[PDB]
């Protein structure tokens, strides 16, 4: 069961409304392991607040170490199901362009080899 499945559409909209009042300079981001991804570990939490000045390069780095990944274990962040955002892009811009209808910004993480394997 994903985050969207355990909580209705109305609950998530309200949830976004409230947390944005509390943190006007943070982006609410839902970060989950991609369903086909078995090699990379799971995170302990699903819901994150990222400071809105952060770029994608910095967010990947934060997720890397929070995942305790080794030198050469690559992972890709797919945003809003369909997008691979250039690393320099600020997340505030990614929020405004890629946020879900419910007001969350959704991401899944997977190795390139996992995304490759699934496309093939």
């Amino acid at each position: 069961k994903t985050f969207k499945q355990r909580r209705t559409f109305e609950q998530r909209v309200e949830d976004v409304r409230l947390i944005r009042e509390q943190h006007p300079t943070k982006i609410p981001v839902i970060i989950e392991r991609y369903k086909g991804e078995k090699q990379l570990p799971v995170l302990d939490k699903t819901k994150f607040l990222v400071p809105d000045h952060v770029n994608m390069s910095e967010l990947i780095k934060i997720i890397r170490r929070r995942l305790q990944l080794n030198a050469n274990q690559a992972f890709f962040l797919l945003v809003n199901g369909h997008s691979m955002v250039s690393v320099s892009t600020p997340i505030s811009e990614v929020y405004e362009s890629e946020k879900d209808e419910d007001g969350f910004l959704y991401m899944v993480y997977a190795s390139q080899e996992t995304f490759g394997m699934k496309l093939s």
Binding site: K47, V50, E58, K61, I62, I63
Partner: peptide
């Protein structure tokens, strides 16, 4: 249920 702040 709580959020986690991801700072650098």
């Amino acid at each position: 249920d709580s959020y986690e702040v991801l700072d650098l």
